Design a binder for these strands. Structure first.
Ligand SMILES: Nc1ccn([C@@H]2O[C@H](COP(=O)(O)OP(=O)(O)OP(=O)(O)O)[C@@H](O)[C@H]2O)c(=O)n1
Ligand SMILES: [Mg+2]
Lengths: 251, 50, 1341, 277
RNA sequence: GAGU
DNA sequence: TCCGCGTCAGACTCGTAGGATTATAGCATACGTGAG
DNA sequence: CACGTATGCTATAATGTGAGTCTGACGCGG
């Protein structure tokens, strides 16, 4: 692919394929030319070296260093490592309708609520706004609905308030050591950029407000909403699954 | 360490007691960075098995 | 005796220990080191001189041609730091080197009388260090960090078990050169000595001695002590050395003369030994059976036959003894090898050694390094000599040779860089001594074995690499070419050297963006030591032992400043007084104690020197101008600490601060803080963003002023004198005659840097400290940098703080702030953000920066001017266009809808897109500045041209005012010289100053002064011309940019960010918090006096944290402000200068045993009211580190303020008006706003762009990224029920391409149904496994 | 434990015969006549020469082995086109061929985006000129400075130096540590966000409803011209193929369809609302 | 380089 | 059973920067496709 | 027919190479 700078950027697999093809074609040539056997042999060694580098580089001894000095990333290297494809792209992923910000106390909240910044929530529930806007006939189409949100018009806030009602949001803190590291709350729209967390659940998250942050995630489907409200809600996860004693307690 | 810190924080440590404190402190901090990994690796081995 | 800037505001000192040595220049290291690299020394191989003499002279392979180095020179820098920073170029000097191509005749033997060609060739530009200690690389300020590595020399180490559950300690020696292969010696479980060259395969140690031409008998004579066996008549005798037996058990009945000393089968004690020695025992009769096992030393042959009866190093028997006797030998030299002390190691290693002679040994060595390749004798001698015995490939360096010689207990420090045969044997000897039990192992973590490499050494090395790459090219071309036509410059290439150095100063790990959040951040970064990067440890390699505090770190490295992270213990801040010895070891100052009396004689001791002396503690009480008060002084030696008598004491700690680094020195009551919390405190001070109003710290230490001055961010006066002209831009000082040189005009101009961008996009602004017409001395602060008060360092703002709960608004470290803080714009911070718009040339054609942009509102284009550039001063908000840019879009095949749409509005606006630079979303600021960089040939924009008009006329004005003030100041002197011996006061002023070339007086020294002033006047006259031509050239000069790029417009936004919930704040005792709520003034707890508290912090975040420093800081802070409130009250009521003077003298001279004396009096009345006006906003106090204020001194100070001794006050709730039920601790904590603003942290995303291969959403707020749903987070949903939430997160939310669009449509349609698919990552996985040649198929139902 | 491909090959070459002058003449005459053994022995004996030049041609593009093999190709052509009748030695002639084939291969294989020898040769002269400029101008060559010296166009010099720009690895993690690879920064550009794709869905759906809101002869002429309902995007003149068969009446009716549709966008709530877009 |  | 080899090495966040590095001969015929 | 790309030939003799090291715990195989 072309970078913006006019330059190109490519996978190392291209360098390894080019190695293999060059040496293979040169071998075809030296066979057409009836070359003496010492030279044919050298080319057959080099061909096996190139294929072995292409499949799994570094296993057959000294890995082939490209441009920096770093060994070229081979096929097996894209599967194998923790970084491969299994651990990185398949057993966990980056996710839409996800946000984060610093957390701060909400002592006024009840146990099942959390302060969610206005601008953050505007963005996370964008399709849900577009949807209600068209059912009220306030927006003629989606692009007009988008421009009404861009302009952050006063009627849009009222619609957004209506969508967030009874809609649960997942709060997550790193690291997620046990299941209570994710909990569902009913959000409360708040002016300001910080997420407000109920004190009593700070225990499960191991949340202390000296700059910790949290991920927000929006359960989209009816099923996901129900699993959040019934199974993952703060109120419903009072006792530790580890021992009988509850985690959500005053301190 | 064979020599304990006789003083407390209200009293204030002296240069020697503070320097001696450092060892324990930094081993604690290095422990959180490095060992977390083996704790976490055990969580992950456990999860894969069950 | 106080300086002018201290007369304005004096800090009260609670320190009691008189400082014999002042804090040195803190950025000493960076400047000295680089200065050594560029420094022209004829002899002292330092930097370039060394580099050239090392490589050169390079002689050809044929040997006819050679290139030799004469000298080098740095051209002056093409662009100043300023132009480099703006343009985005490296600040460097061109390196021009004189080189002489000399040629020999092949016909004559070594006739040098053929061709000598000498010329000055360019080899790269070398980046220059700024006077501050930084490099400007591609227009960015960067700092190169000193390194800590294992010192060249020898090291004796030992696997403590590890290998072989046997649990054998295997001893090893490692010889480390500065350059060359490593030489390892090691033991094996079977006590065989082995050599690893370059840590390759193992070889028997004796083989290396054979390579150095050692016969077997000579080897044994080297390691082993001989024993003499005389065969007299028939009985066997042996020459006894009284001790040798010693701690052995007697195997035979030992009889001496006729009388029995030892009993057979009993252990020989000290009495037997002294009895035998005193009796003078030299022969003892022994059984023949005892020799079975003894090792013969020499070759013994039959003088009759001339054949070898027994070879050297062979185990004797009863029959070999018999054969030896009858041949005619009645003397047998045997080896002494008694286990325990004298082990037969080399004896056994010779038996393992397969080689015989020297050649056989050299072949085996050759075969190890180059296995397969047949030996030749020439090849094996060459290889072995080129390993450790070649001046070119092996160099211990002076430090290597020095540490080597001291480790082997030599007398001589200096010697050869190449290993001698004696060196290697001495090392083997010491190894074996250590195995035996006499001698000890060296410690790797010991600072006596860890050496510091700063910049100049590192620049030197990269520069040597460049030269080596050049040497191959040069030698290659010297041999091939005809010698006579060919000159030296066609052979040299500059690009290799330039590339080596460019890669160091730009790509290197140690070259990093200067941490410019604040002065302390900068100063601490420039004194960093890293064990990482090239030639050092890795995070993988780094254990637990290296990381922890070593005893030798005392006075050299900070124990409490290290990143809390993976780099914990590998990165180290240097201690305050610490410095590098000539060889590069760290050393620390100590006061010599002579005859018990403690002199002011100060000695810097290295890690190794320190171990040897007993050093008293700094807190040790000295008696008034002589010896220690106390009999048993608390001292430390041999790395451990206890009581000593006075006569034993050799030395003492110079300051109480020398243990600690710079950053930790700024923490007031460090003594009362846990070391962990203190570490994070010193770490967060570096993160402190300078506020709009730089506020001094009420509770300081004294390092405040040192740091502000040494950082270089403050303008300091070199010459002093009186200020002629202040301006919010410049300061001109007229110098005093005593420092003012009679050559040049004596007027100093300091230009102040106005509101400039930092690397962290913070604001750098210099404001003038002094007023118009103020007298100043050398080293007075003339202008304050960004986070500095009148000369002192001011990282944040002190505040009225109360420790008490609020309605959970301070739950876990959460902070409750008064609205008054926001109103007073305290912790309001300035961010200058730099945005670039790049006009590139594409395959379709060049991009245009016109205001003429397809499909754009008049609202948007209002703010752009003719060229398409926003106006200076224009306020902008997200989505506003800053620089309009349009890109040629060729082959614009439209969708039918777009054909219709473009037909309806007719706004075809032609085949051009919209790629305009617009304000990033949600950031909002005012445009302060615009810069345009164009190529040379391309026609200038109208706006670019008016910018150059401004710069040209402004340049003309600047230079004109230079020549005018310099001429006025110069003739003002001529006027005074002419009066000397020629009274013409009124008569000289009337005729014009321009016609004063005619004016002289009689031929004396005063006539010569007139000549000096006249030659300078004209010198300045032409100088002004060539300066103006330079400026004009740089202003017209078109800049060479990246290929593809036609022009670049840089916009600077000025953003004012207000403090707000989510913002991170901390103190200096590692006490952090996030602001939870901003409370109305009415609501905040208030005093009996009605004064509301600024910040409400939680009590419960102190006793658990064990940082008690913050509470002492708060009590003292209130006492400081108590006295400020009294002075404020006396200044409001005018009152008497006498009365103010009384109160202020009683105040400064309060403390029980205050070191600092302040005999107020001498202060003139005007100095006193300027001082009180500064002391009014709270009397600033200094609590040194470990010599701080005592509780009793703080309570005494509180009583002087009429504040309570408890430092707790009655508080009233703002809301209810009722009192809180018990007293609350209130006072002033100096607080910091860290760089972590919620404004640049808060991120949200519904749908966005998606990754290239994996199709998952991107990461990071800059790329508008989704939060990563990690394994850990998945497992949580697995534990719950939540299966749909999990699938959602796996599929329609990430990869599933069809699914995500379909479900988006459903959510706008209000269906809330998933309709899942297949994640694109998996399709790829399959393809990647089939690419491996594994068939992986999906099997259907 | 000789495992290395290179050291094995260099062991094999060392094990060869070294040829003299009279020997080269005898084998060379037999070789050109078409001897099997003569060709093989001349090649095998002169492999050492390939390596000596191949060793002094590394760190530029390919690996030592790679250069050694392409260099060997030069040796073969050298043996094929050697003239033993000329008194001048083989080593001299072979050196040319070995250097030629190595250089040619290094100019083609090295660069990921394959650059033609014509441009590469031009590039050579630009760079050599830059070197001589650099030795005297303490600074580095500008594009214009190089163009002045060669008496050539600035634009042509700039195109060439742009082609010099070597490729960045996508798979390489950048942030000093192996943190984030460039791949994961760089988004699929051809690919529109679901927001933009859904906007096109809304437009395309509205059009269908907009085609059954105007006149029957106003949506038939307007749609089939732009290629909205029809199969091919025709022009005002080409709408005559269907049934319209007019030039003026097609243009009046096209614009009449768009004018009534402009009022349909002003009333629904777009027009200037959807003008910015 | 820093964040948890 | 002694010991060389290979396999792991906790989870998420943001910030960067460098494009940098490099050398190669020059010219005539041959092979092949595209444009006017 | 021009333009873009490729295969061709050159003649003093020259004919043998050439980074970074030190992690630590466990589980099989030679
Ligand atoms: N390197 C780190 C640092 C922190 N954390 C997480 O962040 C929490 C808070 O870290 P920190 O603020 O250092 O500790 P606290 O217990 O909050 O103590 P304090 O803030 O008072 O120092 C830890 O419990 C842990 O879950 C982590 O996972 N890895
Ligand atoms: Mg925290």
């Amino acid at each position: 692919v072309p970078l913006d700078g006019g330059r190109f950027a490519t996978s190392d697999l291209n360098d390894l394929y080019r190695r293999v093809i060059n040496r293979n074609n040169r071998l075809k040539r030296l066979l057409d030319l009836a070359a003496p056997d010492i030279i044919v042999r050298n080319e057959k060694r080099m061909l096996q070296e190139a294929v072995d580098a292409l499949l799994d580089n570094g296993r057959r001894g000294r890995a082939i260093t490209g441009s920096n000095k770093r060994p070229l990333k081979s096929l097996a290297d894209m599967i194998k490592g923790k970084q491969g494809r299994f651990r990185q792209n398949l057993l966990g992923k980056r996710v839409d309708y996800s946000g984060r910000s610093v957390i701060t106390v909400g002592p006024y909240l009840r146990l099942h609520q959390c302060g969610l910044p206005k601008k953050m929530a505007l963005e996370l529930f964008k399709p849900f706004i577009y949807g209600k806007l068209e059912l009220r006939g306030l927006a003629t189409t989606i692009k007009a609905a988008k421009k009404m949100v861009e302009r952050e018009e006063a009627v849009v806030w009222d619609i957004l308030d209506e969508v967030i009602r009874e809609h649960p949001v997942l709060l997550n803190r790193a690291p997620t050591l046990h299941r209570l590291g994710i909990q569902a709350f009913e959000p409360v729209l708040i002016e300001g950029k910080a997420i407000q967390l109920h004190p009593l659940v700070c225990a499960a998250y191991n949340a202390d407000f000296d700059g910790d942050q949290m991920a927000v995630h929006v359960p989209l489907t009816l099923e996901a909403q129900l699993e959040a409200r019934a199974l993952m809600m703060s109120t419903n996860n009072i006792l530790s699954p580890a021992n009988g004693e509850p985690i959500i307690v005053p301190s | 360490i064979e020599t304990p810190i006789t003083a407390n924080f209200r009293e204030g440590l002296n240069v020697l007691q503070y320097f001696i404190s450092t060892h324990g402190a930094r081993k604690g901090l290095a422990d959180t960075a490095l060992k977390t990994a083996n704790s976490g690796y055990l969580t992950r081995r456990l999860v894969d098995v069950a | 005796v106080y300086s002018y800037t201290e007369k304005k505001r004096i800090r009260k000192d609670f320190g009691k220990r008189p400082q014999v040595l002042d804090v040195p220049y803190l950025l000493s290291i960076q400047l000295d080191s680089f200065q050594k690299f560029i420094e022209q020394d004829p002899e002292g191989q330092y930097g370039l001189e060394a580099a050239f003499r090392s490589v050169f002279p390079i002689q050809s392979y044929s040997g006819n041609s050679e290139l030799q180095y004469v000298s080098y020179r740095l051209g002056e820098p093409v662009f100043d730091v300023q132009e480099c920073q703006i343009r985005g170029v490296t600040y460097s000097a061109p390196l021009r080197v004189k080189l002489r191509l000399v040629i020999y005749e092949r016909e004559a033997p070594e006739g040098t009388v053929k061709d000598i060609k000498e010329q000055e060739v360019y080899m790269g530009e070398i980046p220059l260090m700024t006077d501050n200690g930084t490099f400007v690389i591609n227009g960015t300020e960067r700092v190169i960090v000193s390194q800590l590595h294992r010192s060249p020399g020898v090291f004796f180490d030992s696997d403590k078990g590890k290998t072989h559950s046997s649990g054998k300690v295997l001893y090893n020696a490692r010889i480390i050169p500065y350059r060359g292969s490593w030489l390892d010696f090691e033991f094996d479980p079977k006590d065989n000595l082995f050599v690893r060259i370059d840590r390759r395969r193992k070889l028997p140690a004796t083989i290396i001695l054979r390579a150095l031409n050692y016969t077997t008998e000579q080897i044994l004579d080297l390691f082993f002590e001989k024993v003499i066996f005389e065969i007299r008549d028939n009985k066997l005798q042996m020459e006894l050395v009284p001790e040798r037996l010693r701690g052995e058990t007697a195997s035979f009945d030992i009889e001496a003369n006729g009388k029995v000393y030892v009993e057979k089968g009993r252990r020989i004690t000290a009495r037997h030994i002294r009895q035998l020695e005193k009796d003078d025992v030299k022969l003892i009769e022994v059984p023949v059976e005892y020799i079975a096992g003894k090792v013969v030393a020499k070759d013994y042959i039959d003088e009759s036959t001339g054949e070898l009866i027994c070879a050297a190093n062979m185990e004797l028997s009863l029959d070999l003894l018999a054969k030896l006797s009858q041949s005619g030998h009645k003397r047998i030299e045997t080896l002494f090898t008694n286990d325990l002390d004298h082990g037969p190691y080399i004896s056994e290693t010779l038996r393992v050694d397969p080689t015989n002679d020297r050649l056989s040994a050299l072949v085996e060595i050759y075969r190890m390094m180059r296995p397969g390749e047949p030996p030749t004798r020439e090849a094996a001698e060459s290889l072995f000599e080129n390993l450790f015995f070649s001046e070119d490939r092996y160099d211990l360096s002076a430090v290597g040779r020095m540490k080597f010689n001291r480790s082997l207990l030599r007398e001589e420090i200096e010697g050869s860089g190449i290993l001698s045969k004696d060196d290697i044997i001495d090392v083997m000897k010491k190894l074996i001594d250590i195995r035996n039990g006499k001698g000890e192992v060296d410690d790797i973590d010991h600072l006596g074995n860890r050496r510091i490499r700063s910049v100049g050494e590192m620049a030197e090395n990269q520069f040597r690499v460049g030269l080596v790459r050049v040497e191959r090219a040069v030698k290659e071309r010297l041999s091939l070419g005809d010698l006579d036509t060919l000159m030296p410059q066609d052979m040299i290439n500059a690009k290799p050297i330039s590339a080596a150095v460019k890669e160091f100063f730009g790509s290197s790990q140690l070259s990093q963006f200067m941490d410019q959040n604040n002065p302390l951040s900068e100063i601490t970064h420039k004194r960093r030591i890293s064990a990482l990067g090239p030639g050092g440890l890795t995070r993988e390699r780094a254990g637990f032992e290296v990381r922890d505090v070593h005893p030798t770190h005392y006075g050299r490295v900070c124990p409490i400043e290290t990143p809390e992270g993976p780099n914990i213990g590998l990165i180290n801040s240097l201690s305050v007084y610490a410095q590098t010895n000539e060889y590069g070891f760290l050393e620390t100052p100590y006061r010599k104690v002579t005859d018990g009396v403690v002199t002011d004689e100060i000695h810097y001791l290295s890690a190794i020197e320190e171990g040897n002396y007993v050093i008293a503690q700094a807190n040790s009480n000295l008696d008034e101008e002589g010896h220690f008060v106390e009999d048993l002084v608390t001292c430390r030696s041999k790395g451990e600490s206890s009581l000593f008598s006075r006569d034993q004491v050799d030395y003492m700690d110079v300051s109480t601060q020398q243990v600690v680094s710079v950053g930790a020195s700024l923490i007031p009551f460090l003594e009362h803080d846990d070391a962990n919390r203190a570490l994070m405190g010193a770490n967060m001070q570096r993160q402190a963003v300078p506020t709009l109003r730089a506020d001094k710290p009420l509770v300081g230490t004294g390092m405040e002023r040192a740091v502000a001055v040494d950082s270089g961010v403050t303008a300091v006066a070199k010459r002093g004198g009186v200020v002629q002209y202040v301006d919010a831009s410049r300061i001109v000082i007229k110098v005093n005659e005593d420092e003012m040189y009679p050559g040049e005009a004596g007027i100093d101009i300091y230009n102040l840097t106005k509101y400039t961008r930092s690397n962290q996009n913070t604001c750098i602004n210099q404001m003038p400290c002094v007023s118009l017409g103020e007298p100043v001395e050398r080293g007075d602060v003339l202008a304050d940098g960004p986070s500095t008060d009148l000369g002192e360092l001011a990282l944040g703002q002190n505040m009225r703080v109360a420790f008490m709960p609020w309605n959970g608004y301070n739950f876990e470290d959460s902070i409750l702030v008064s609205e008054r803080v926001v109103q007073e714009d305290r912790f309001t911070t300035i961010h200058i953000q730099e945005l670039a718009c790049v006009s590139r040339d594409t395959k379709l054609g060049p991009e245009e920066i016109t205001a003429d942009i397809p499909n754009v509102g008049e609202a948007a284009l209002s703010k752009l001017d003719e060229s398409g550039i926003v106006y200076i001063g224009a306020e902008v908000t997200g989505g506003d266009i800053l620089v309009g840019k349009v890109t040629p879009k060729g082959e614009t095949q439209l969708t039918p809808e777009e054909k219709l749409l473009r037909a309806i509005f007719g706004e075809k606006a032609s085949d051009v897109k919209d790629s305009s630079l617009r304000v990033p979303n949600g950031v909002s600021g005012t445009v302060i500045d615009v810069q345009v960089f164009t190529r040379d040939g391309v026609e200038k924009d109208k706006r670019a041209l008016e910018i150059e008009e401004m710069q040209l006329k402004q340049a003309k004005k600047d230079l004109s005012e230079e020549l005018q003030i310099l001429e006025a100041g110069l003739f003002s002197r001529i006027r005074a010289v002419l009066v000397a011996g020629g009274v013409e006061a009124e008569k000289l002023d009337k005729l014009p100053r321009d016609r004063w070339l005619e004016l002289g007086l009689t031929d004396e020294e005063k006539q010569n002064q007139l000549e000096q002033l006249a030659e300078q006047y004209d010198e300045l006259k032409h100088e002004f011309e060539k300066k103006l031509e330079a400026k004009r050239r740089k202003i017209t000069q078109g800049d060479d940019l990246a290929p593809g790029v036609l022009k670049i417009v840089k916009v600077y936004l000025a953003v004012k960010r207000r403090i707000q919930p989510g913002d991170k704040m901390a103190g200096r005792h590692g006490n952090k918090g996030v602001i939870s709520k901003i409370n109305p003034i009415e609501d905040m707890p208030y005093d009996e006096n009605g004064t509301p508290v600024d910040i409400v912090l939680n009590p419960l975040g102190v006793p658990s944290r064990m940082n008690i420093g913050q509470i002492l800081e708060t009590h003292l802070g209130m006492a400081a402000k108590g006295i400020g409130d009294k002075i404020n009250a006396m200044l409001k009521q005018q009152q008497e200068v006498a009365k103010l003077r009384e109160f202020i003298q009683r105040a400064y001279d309060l403390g029980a045993d205050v070191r600092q004396k302040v005999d107020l009096s001498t202060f003139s009345d005007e100095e006193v009211m300027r001082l009180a006006e500064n002391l009014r906003k709270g009397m600033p106090i200094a609590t040194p580190v470990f010599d701080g204020a005592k509780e009793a001194e703080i309570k005494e100070l509180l009583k002087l303020g009429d504040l309570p001794t408890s430092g707790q006050i009655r508080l009233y709730d703002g809301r209810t008006g009722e009192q809180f039920e018990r007293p609350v601790t209130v006072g002033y904590m100096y607080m910091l706003k860290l760089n972590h603003l919620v404004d640049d942290k808060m991120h949200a995303r519904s749908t966005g762009s998606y990754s290239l291969v994996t199709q998952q959403p991107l990461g990071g707020k800059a790329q508008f990224g989704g939060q990563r749903f990690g394994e850990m987070e998945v497992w949580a949903l697995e534990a719950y029920g939540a299966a749909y939430t999990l699938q959602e997160m796996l599929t329609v939310k990430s990869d599933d391409v069809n699914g995500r669009t379909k479900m988006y449509k459903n959510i706008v349609d209000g269906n809330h149904q998933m309709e899942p698919g297949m994640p694109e990552s998996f399709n790829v996985l399959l393809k990647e496994i089939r690419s491996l040649g594994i068939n992986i198929e999906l099997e259907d139902e | 434990r000789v495992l290395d491909a290179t050291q094995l090959y260099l062991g094999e070459i060392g094990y060869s015969p070294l040829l003299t002058a009279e020997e080269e003449v005898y084998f060379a005459r037999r070789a050109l006549r078409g001897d099997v053994a003569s060709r093989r022995r001349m090649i095998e004996s002169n492999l050492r020469l390939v390596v000596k030049i191949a060793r002094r041609y590394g760190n530029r593009g390919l690996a030592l082995l790679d250069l050694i093999e392409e260099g060997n190709l030069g040796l073969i052509r050298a043996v094929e086109k050697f003239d033993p009748e000329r008194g001048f030695r083989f080593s001299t002639y072979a050196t040319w061929w070995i250097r030629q084939t190595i250089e040619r291969a290094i100019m083609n294989q090295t660069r990921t985006i394959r650059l033609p020898i014509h441009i590469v040769k031009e590039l050579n002269v630009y760079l050599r000129t830059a070197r001589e400029l650099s030795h005297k101008l303490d600074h580095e060559p500008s594009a214009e400075e190089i163009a002045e010296q060669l008496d050539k166009p600035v634009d042509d010099v700039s195109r060439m130096l742009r082609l010099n720009e070597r490729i960045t690895s996508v798979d390489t993690p950048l942030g000093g540590d192996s943190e984030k690879a460039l791949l994961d920064i760089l988004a699929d550009e051809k690919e529109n966000g679901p927001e933009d794709t859904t906007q096109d869905d809304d437009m395309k759906q509205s059009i269908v409803k907009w085609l059954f809101e105007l006149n029957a002869k106003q949506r038939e002429v307007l749609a089939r011209r732009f290629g909205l309902l029809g199969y091919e995007a025709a022009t005002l003149e080409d709408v005559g193929r269907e049934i319209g068969l007019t030039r003026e009446r097609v243009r009046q009716i096209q614009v009449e369809g768009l004018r009534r549709l402009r009022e349909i966008l002003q009333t629904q709530g777009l027009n200037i609302e959807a003008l910015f877009l």
